[PDB]
Amino acid sequence: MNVLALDTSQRIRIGLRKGEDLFEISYTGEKKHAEILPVVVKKLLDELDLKVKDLDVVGVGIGPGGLTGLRVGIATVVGLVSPYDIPVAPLNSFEMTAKSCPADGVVLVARRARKGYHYCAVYLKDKGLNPLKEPSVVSDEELEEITKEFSPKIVLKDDLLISPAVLVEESERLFREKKTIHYYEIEPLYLQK
Amino acid sequence: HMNVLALDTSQRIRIGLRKGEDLFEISYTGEKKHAEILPVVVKKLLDELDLKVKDLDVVGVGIGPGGLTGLRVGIATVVGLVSPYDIPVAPLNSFEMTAKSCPADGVVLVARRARKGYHYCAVYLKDKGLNPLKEPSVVSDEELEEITKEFSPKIVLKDDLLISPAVLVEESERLFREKKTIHYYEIE
């Protein structure tokens, strides 16, 4: 199974698998230096003797996150896959954050949007990931009400670990479950929700 | 923040390279042939950051528990790298790094397989910092389940361990600031 997965909702997270062999790469900081990543990735593809043509699925994160980062990551994936119609797995960044956490139980994912607001979701992670409150934007006051309502055992605020390995595992699962879509269908239903 | 390279080869290969607020993290898992590329990648990253090795403030290296060969190799790699310049070295406990790589707080059991019938095992209290309730040791598999019944951990990091290269960099930065680094000739 050949997989490439990319999330740009906060940092740059890239995951590359060919069979039992997985590279993971992250970058955070000033944008000037992210330039080196395509080069780096090409080198890793060359090492694995993998051509973009041979990928079974490409995973991309659809947010919630920063607009700029997300449109860059998505346009990148849309373009890479376009010539060969490689199935795309749209990945929920909040769900990738939850599953990147090795503990189980009631989890609350939040992250700053402007001034006095946050994006926010809560999941029961005891199977399983099972949504109790789907991601949306809330005031800080409502955030406290929500926390006080779900007494989450685990809470992942602001600086979110996403594991590229989980991205890759998640693209694989969507592929197998026939829940991937075509590159031309990622605008329409990244708008609608 | 400063200029830091850190590396743990206790199970998979984890690498963090930071310059100020810029940080690259790399991990590899799978057959050893392909690890050949990691040093090329890391040199491209260093050139991209305008970092020479002599510009590094500290180099972190994982010292286990883990696979002995992989530890020996990661350590040897570090010795080759820093001995010309005596860059301060931060030894990193792999289980502590694993525990710290987990977002949740509470009582954390960390365990990995050591040989037929045995695990390396440790227990920490995560409440803000990390506090060793039991330092790493080799227990029998029966002892392991006893340790588990008995400490009632909220969280259990077993056999397949997530270590975040960002965490290795943060830790190396700390030991440097606390002057609890050592010389390349002192690592084991």
PDB file of N, CA, C and O in Angstrom, chain A residues 101-104 152-156, chain B residues 99-109 124-131 152-157:
ATOM      1  N   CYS A 101      -3.535  11.040  19.789  1.00  0.00           N
ATOM      2  CA  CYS A 101      -3.342  11.077  21.211  1.00  0.00           C
ATOM      3  C   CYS A 101      -3.552   9.673  21.692  1.00  0.00           C
ATOM      4  O   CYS A 101      -4.636   9.138  21.520  1.00  0.00           O
ATOM      5  N   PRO A 102      -2.519   9.075  22.324  1.00  0.00           N
ATOM      6  CA  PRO A 102      -2.545   7.646  22.619  1.00  0.00           C
ATOM      7  C   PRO A 102      -3.446   7.268  23.766  1.00  0.00           C
ATOM      8  O   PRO A 102      -3.746   6.098  23.943  1.00  0.00           O
ATOM      9  N   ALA A 103      -3.856   8.247  24.557  1.00  0.00           N
ATOM     10  CA  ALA A 103      -4.820   8.007  25.624  1.00  0.00           C
ATOM     11  C   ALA A 103      -6.221   7.902  25.030  1.00  0.00           C
ATOM     12  O   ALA A 103      -6.443   8.333  23.893  1.00  0.00           O
ATOM     13  N   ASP A 104      -7.141   7.343  25.815  1.00  0.00           N
ATOM     14  CA  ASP A 104      -8.545   7.208  25.452  1.00  0.00           C
ATOM     15  C   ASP A 104      -9.460   7.884  26.445  1.00  0.00           C
ATOM     16  O   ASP A 104      -9.041   8.213  27.538  1.00  0.00           O
ATOM     17  N   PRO A 152     -14.304  16.686  30.040  1.00  0.00           N
ATOM     18  CA  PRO A 152     -13.369  15.870  29.306  1.00  0.00           C
ATOM     19  C   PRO A 152     -12.191  15.435  30.189  1.00  0.00           C
ATOM     20  O   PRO A 152     -11.632  16.245  30.933  1.00  0.00           O
ATOM     21  N   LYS A 153     -11.859  14.149  30.111  1.00  0.00           N
ATOM     22  CA  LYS A 153     -10.650  13.615  30.698  1.00  0.00           C
ATOM     23  C   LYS A 153      -9.420  14.177  29.958  1.00  0.00           C
ATOM     24  O   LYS A 153      -8.449  14.528  30.587  1.00  0.00           O
ATOM     25  N   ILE A 154      -9.450  14.281  28.636  1.00  0.00           N
ATOM     26  CA  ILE A 154      -8.320  14.867  27.893  1.00  0.00           C
ATOM     27  C   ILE A 154      -8.714  16.139  27.108  1.00  0.00           C
ATOM     28  O   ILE A 154      -9.817  16.214  26.560  1.00  0.00           O
ATOM     29  N   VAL A 155      -7.786  17.104  27.042  1.00  0.00           N
ATOM     30  CA  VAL A 155      -8.026  18.431  26.474  1.00  0.00           C
ATOM     31  C   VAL A 155      -6.828  18.914  25.650  1.00  0.00           C
ATOM     32  O   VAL A 155      -5.787  19.221  26.189  1.00  0.00           O
ATOM     33  N   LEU A 156      -7.009  19.058  24.347  1.00  0.00           N
ATOM     34  CA  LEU A 156      -5.931  19.437  23.451  1.00  0.00           C
ATOM     35  C   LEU A 156      -6.201  20.829  22.877  1.00  0.00           C
ATOM     36  O   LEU A 156      -6.920  20.969  21.913  1.00  0.00           O
TER      37      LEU A 156
ATOM     38  N   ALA B  99       6.720   9.382  27.439  1.00  0.00           N
ATOM     39  CA  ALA B  99       5.752   9.954  28.372  1.00  0.00           C
ATOM     40  C   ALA B  99       5.437  11.436  28.080  1.00  0.00           C
ATOM     41  O   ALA B  99       4.292  11.888  28.065  1.00  0.00           O
ATOM     42  N   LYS B 100       6.474  12.209  27.871  1.00  0.00           N
ATOM     43  CA  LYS B 100       6.286  13.618  27.588  1.00  0.00           C
ATOM     44  C   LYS B 100       5.663  13.848  26.188  1.00  0.00           C
ATOM     45  O   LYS B 100       5.122  14.904  25.930  1.00  0.00           O
ATOM     46  N   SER B 101       5.690  12.844  25.316  1.00  0.00           N
ATOM     47  CA  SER B 101       5.155  12.984  23.958  1.00  0.00           C
ATOM     48  C   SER B 101       3.678  12.726  23.940  1.00  0.00           C
ATOM     49  O   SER B 101       3.034  12.812  22.905  1.00  0.00           O
ATOM     50  N   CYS B 102       3.133  12.432  25.106  1.00  0.00           N
ATOM     51  CA  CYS B 102       1.745  12.148  25.204  1.00  0.00           C
ATOM     52  C   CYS B 102       1.017  13.362  25.802  1.00  0.00           C
ATOM     53  O   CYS B 102       1.298  13.760  26.906  1.00  0.00           O
ATOM     54  N   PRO B 103       0.057  13.946  25.086  1.00  0.00           N
ATOM     55  CA  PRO B 103      -0.646  15.192  25.554  1.00  0.00           C
ATOM     56  C   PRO B 103      -1.333  15.133  26.937  1.00  0.00           C
ATOM     57  O   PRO B 103      -1.174  16.020  27.773  1.00  0.00           O
ATOM     58  N   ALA B 104      -2.086  14.084  27.192  1.00  0.00           N
ATOM     59  CA  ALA B 104      -2.678  13.912  28.513  1.00  0.00           C
ATOM     60  C   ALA B 104      -1.678  13.945  29.704  1.00  0.00           C
ATOM     61  O   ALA B 104      -0.492  13.618  29.574  1.00  0.00           O
ATOM     62  N   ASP B 105      -2.193  14.398  30.848  1.00  0.00           N
ATOM     63  CA  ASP B 105      -1.545  14.313  32.165  1.00  0.00           C
ATOM     64  C   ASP B 105      -2.186  13.172  33.017  1.00  0.00           C
ATOM     65  O   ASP B 105      -3.203  12.593  32.649  1.00  0.00           O
ATOM     66  N   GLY B 106      -1.588  12.894  34.167  1.00  0.00           N
ATOM     67  CA  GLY B 106      -1.961  11.776  34.998  1.00  0.00           C
ATOM     68  C   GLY B 106      -0.822  10.772  35.124  1.00  0.00           C
ATOM     69  O   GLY B 106       0.353  11.047  34.782  1.00  0.00           O
ATOM     70  N   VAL B 107      -1.193   9.594  35.632  1.00  0.00           N
ATOM     71  CA  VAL B 107      -0.259   8.508  35.827  1.00  0.00           C
ATOM     72  C   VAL B 107      -0.120   7.717  34.530  1.00  0.00           C
ATOM     73  O   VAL B 107      -1.104   7.156  34.034  1.00  0.00           O
ATOM     74  N   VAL B 108       1.120   7.665  34.023  1.00  0.00           N
ATOM     75  CA  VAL B 108       1.471   7.035  32.753  1.00  0.00           C
ATOM     76  C   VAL B 108       2.389   5.804  32.905  1.00  0.00           C
ATOM     77  O   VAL B 108       3.475   5.863  33.444  1.00  0.00           O
ATOM     78  N   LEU B 109       1.946   4.672  32.403  1.00  0.00           N
ATOM     79  CA  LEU B 109       2.801   3.533  32.398  1.00  0.00           C
ATOM     80  C   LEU B 109       3.410   3.472  31.015  1.00  0.00           C
ATOM     81  O   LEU B 109       2.703   3.567  30.030  1.00  0.00           O
ATOM     82  N   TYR B 124       5.315   7.132  35.446  1.00  0.00           N
ATOM     83  CA  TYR B 124       5.468   8.542  35.756  1.00  0.00           C
ATOM     84  C   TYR B 124       4.156   9.179  36.202  1.00  0.00           C
ATOM     85  O   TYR B 124       3.074   8.737  35.824  1.00  0.00           O
ATOM     86  N   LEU B 125       4.278  10.218  37.025  1.00  0.00           N
ATOM     87  CA  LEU B 125       3.191  11.154  37.284  1.00  0.00           C
ATOM     88  C   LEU B 125       3.358  12.364  36.391  1.00  0.00           C
ATOM     89  O   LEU B 125       4.340  13.101  36.516  1.00  0.00           O
ATOM     90  N   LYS B 126       2.409  12.551  35.484  1.00  0.00           N
ATOM     91  CA  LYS B 126       2.386  13.741  34.644  1.00  0.00           C
ATOM     92  C   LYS B 126       1.354  14.678  35.223  1.00  0.00           C
ATOM     93  O   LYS B 126       0.170  14.392  35.183  1.00  0.00           O
ATOM     94  N   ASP B 127       1.826  15.761  35.816  1.00  0.00           N
ATOM     95  CA  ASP B 127       0.955  16.815  36.313  1.00  0.00           C
ATOM     96  C   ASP B 127       1.853  18.010  36.195  1.00  0.00           C
ATOM     97  O   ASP B 127       2.732  18.210  37.039  1.00  0.00           O
ATOM     98  N   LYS B 128       1.636  18.765  35.116  1.00  0.00           N
ATOM     99  CA  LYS B 128       2.593  19.736  34.611  1.00  0.00           C
ATOM    100  C   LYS B 128       3.852  18.925  34.285  1.00  0.00           C
ATOM    101  O   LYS B 128       3.913  18.241  33.245  1.00  0.00           O
ATOM    102  N   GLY B 129       4.835  18.936  35.175  1.00  0.00           N
ATOM    103  CA  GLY B 129       6.057  18.186  34.894  1.00  0.00           C
ATOM    104  C   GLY B 129       5.926  16.670  34.901  1.00  0.00           C
ATOM    105  O   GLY B 129       4.833  16.079  34.960  1.00  0.00           O
ATOM    106  N   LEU B 130       7.086  16.046  34.833  1.00  0.00           N
ATOM    107  CA  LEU B 130       7.186  14.616  34.856  1.00  0.00           C
ATOM    108  C   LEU B 130       7.899  14.161  36.139  1.00  0.00           C
ATOM    109  O   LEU B 130       9.016  14.596  36.444  1.00  0.00           O
ATOM    110  N   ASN B 131       7.242  13.271  36.873  1.00  0.00           N
ATOM    111  CA  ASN B 131       7.827  12.705  38.076  1.00  0.00           C
ATOM    112  C   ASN B 131       7.844  11.163  38.083  1.00  0.00           C
ATOM    113  O   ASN B 131       6.807  10.528  37.946  1.00  0.00           O
ATOM    114  N   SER B 152      -2.634   1.552  39.021  1.00  0.00           N
ATOM    115  CA  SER B 152      -3.807   2.053  38.277  1.00  0.00           C
ATOM    116  C   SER B 152      -3.533   3.289  37.367  1.00  0.00           C
ATOM    117  O   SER B 152      -4.001   4.400  37.642  1.00  0.00           O
ATOM    118  N   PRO B 153      -2.732   3.112  36.306  1.00  0.00           N
ATOM    119  CA  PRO B 153      -2.464   4.240  35.386  1.00  0.00           C
ATOM    120  C   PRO B 153      -3.689   4.707  34.587  1.00  0.00           C
ATOM    121  O   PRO B 153      -4.450   3.883  34.109  1.00  0.00           O
ATOM    122  N   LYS B 154      -3.869   6.021  34.456  1.00  0.00           N
ATOM    123  CA  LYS B 154      -4.810   6.595  33.477  1.00  0.00           C
ATOM    124  C   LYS B 154      -4.410   6.253  32.032  1.00  0.00           C
ATOM    125  O   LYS B 154      -5.265   6.153  31.169  1.00  0.00           O
ATOM    126  N   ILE B 155      -3.111   6.099  31.777  1.00  0.00           N
ATOM    127  CA  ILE B 155      -2.605   6.013  30.429  1.00  0.00           C
ATOM    128  C   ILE B 155      -1.487   4.998  30.305  1.00  0.00           C
ATOM    129  O   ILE B 155      -0.616   4.893  31.175  1.00  0.00           O
ATOM    130  N   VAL B 156      -1.470   4.304  29.176  1.00  0.00           N
ATOM    131  CA  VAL B 156      -0.622   3.149  29.015  1.00  0.00           C
ATOM    132  C   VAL B 156       0.042   3.120  27.670  1.00  0.00           C
ATOM    133  O   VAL B 156      -0.557   2.709  26.695  1.00  0.00           O
ATOM    134  N   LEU B 157       1.311   3.484  27.643  1.00  0.00           N
ATOM    135  CA  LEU B 157       2.045   3.536  26.399  1.00  0.00           C
ATOM    136  C   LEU B 157       2.872   2.285  26.324  1.00  0.00           C
ATOM    137  O   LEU B 157       3.887   2.182  26.998  1.00  0.00           O
TER     138      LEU B 157
END
